[PDB]
Amino acid sequence: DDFVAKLQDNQRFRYNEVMQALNMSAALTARKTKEFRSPPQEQINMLLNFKDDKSECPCPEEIRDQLLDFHEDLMTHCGIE
Amino acid sequence: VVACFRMAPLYNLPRHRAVNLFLQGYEKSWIETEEHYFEDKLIEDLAKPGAEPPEEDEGTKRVDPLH
User: Fold this and answer.
1) How far is A40 from A4, CA to CA, in rounded Å?
2) Around Cβ A49, how many Cβ atoms within 10 Å?
3) Residues of chain B contacting A17 with CB distance shorter than 8 Å
4) Which residues, at least 6 apart from A48, have a Cβ–Cβ distance to it below 8 Å?
5) φ and ψ at A58, to 5 degrees?
6) DSSP letters of chain B?
7) Contact with chain A for residue B6, Cβ under 8 A
8) Structural contact between residues B2 and A18, judged by C-beta atoms closer than 8 angstroms
9) What distance in Å separates residue A37's CA from the closest CA in chain B?
């Protein structure tokens, strides 16, 4: 409930920055906003890709840490390690 | 291209729909990919003859749980 709320707020902020920065590089804006032009399921998939160190996702460290902590708590609840 | 532009990013979507999408994406991206090795311990614990002489057998060796 709150993880998605903060993720949505950040995606609004990044889109605002993209729109404000569109006027300096139009060619960049294409692949820069392909993320916002991607389907919502693909958006979820690409923003939830900070597992491992591939790090192509635009998710910031502060939002990443909350999910990395909740995943550890869930794994402990499941008794995995 | 304006048709792709107008299509709503996640921040326009209602909270519950985005939550459902996040649940699905989290499932595939994290829950499926997470792996732990337990077979070598499970098949060992099952194969262990459990205290058959300690508890009252007084007969042929009872089949182990794996058996």
Assistant:
1) 13
2) 17
3) none
4) A57, A59, A67, B22, B25, B26, B29, B30
5) -85, 15
6) -HHHHHS--TTTS-HHHHHHHHHHHHIIIIITT-----HHHHHHHHHS--STTTSS--SSPPPPS--
7) no
8) no
9) 5
Residue with tokens 């058996």: B67
Last residue before each gap in chain A (C to N over 2.5 A)? none
Q: What was the experiment behind these coordinates?
A: cryo-EM
Q: How many CB pairs under 8 A join A and B?
A: 65
DSSP state of A53: T
Q: Half-sphere exposure of B3 toward its Cβ, with a 13 Å CA cutoff?
A: 0
Q: Å resolution of this model? A: 3.2
